[PDB]
Design a protein around this ligand. Structure first.
Ligand code: CL
Ligand code: CL
Length: 124
């Protein structure tokens, strides 16, 4: 089984680019990160910052999680991120995604020791 920390890294980290290079970015990333294996994951965000900068958010602004839990943190700075969302043409096994790039504050839920991101709550 994949640990929570490793799943967060695989689903949400892309430190190899400064931002989504093209409209096909999400089709490529959702496939390469194995998020379209048995079903098309509908919505997914990739953060384009170093793994260290994203983990550091767990010691930044403590904000409530949409579920009411208290282990969410919002990044003090905006970070380059790409939101991937299925298009209406998507159906599987031929997943299709719209790529929307921006710079926003990220909110993550953290846990463990070390205290690292395990869920991506939203942008902002
Ligand atoms: Cl791994
Ligand atoms: Cl997401």
């Amino acid at each position: 089984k994949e640990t929570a920390a490793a799943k967060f890294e695989r689903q949400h980290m892309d430190s190899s680019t400064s931002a989504a290079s093209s409209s096909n970015y999400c089709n490529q990333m959702m496939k390469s990160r194995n998020l379209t294996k048995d079903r098309c994951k509908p919505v997914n965000t990739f953060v384009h910052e170093s793994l260290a900068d994203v983990q550091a958010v767990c010691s930044q602004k403590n904000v409530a999680c949409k579920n009411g839990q208290t282990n969410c943190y919002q990044s003090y700075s905006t970070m380059s991120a790409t939101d991937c969302r299925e298009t209406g043409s998507s159906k599987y096994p031929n997943c299709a995604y719209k790529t929307t790039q921006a710079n926003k504050h990220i909110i993550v839920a953290c846990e463990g020791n070390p205290y690292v991101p395990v869920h991506f709550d939203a942008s902002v």
